[PDB]
Amino acid sequence: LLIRKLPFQRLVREIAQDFKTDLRFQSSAVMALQEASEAYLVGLFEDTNLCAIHAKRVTIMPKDIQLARRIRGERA
């Protein structure tokens, strides 16, 4: 993995608390969560970057991300 372990656990925890108030997570279940989030974000960036490329650019802009999301189906 590539995200730091501790600061990821805390985030999952805040959201998890939010829905539902009674809430408990397994140890590997959070591990599985992290490994997904990275895979996804790398998945995402490869797309994002190739919209940077499409624009004949090198630096990626949010506009690139946003496109890559509109085209898949991600809201917002």
């Binding site: 624009a55 004949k56 650019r57 630096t59």
Partner: protein, 70 residues
């Protein structure tokens, strides 16, 4: 109290899958018939600009980088 009308509901669903719509279908001018393809000079002028712009975009950002660094 509760009711509808037509009888071809297996199609108006398919269209709903992809988001297709009835609305822009009465203004069908021939534009599409005839003014819709681009001269190969025109395409190549477009990339020319697409290109120029990309680079400028890229650089202004690097400059921004300097400002942000300090």
């Amino acid at each position: 109290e509760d009711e509808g009308e037509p009888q071809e509901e297996i199609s108006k669903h398919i269209r709903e899958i992809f988001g297709y719509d009835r609305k822009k279908y009465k203004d069908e001018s021939d534009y599409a018939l005839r003014y819709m393809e681009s001269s190969w000079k025109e395409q190549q002028k477009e990339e020319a600009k697409s290109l120029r712009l990309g680079m400028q975009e890229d650089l202004e950002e690097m400059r921004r980088e300097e400002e942000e660094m300090q």
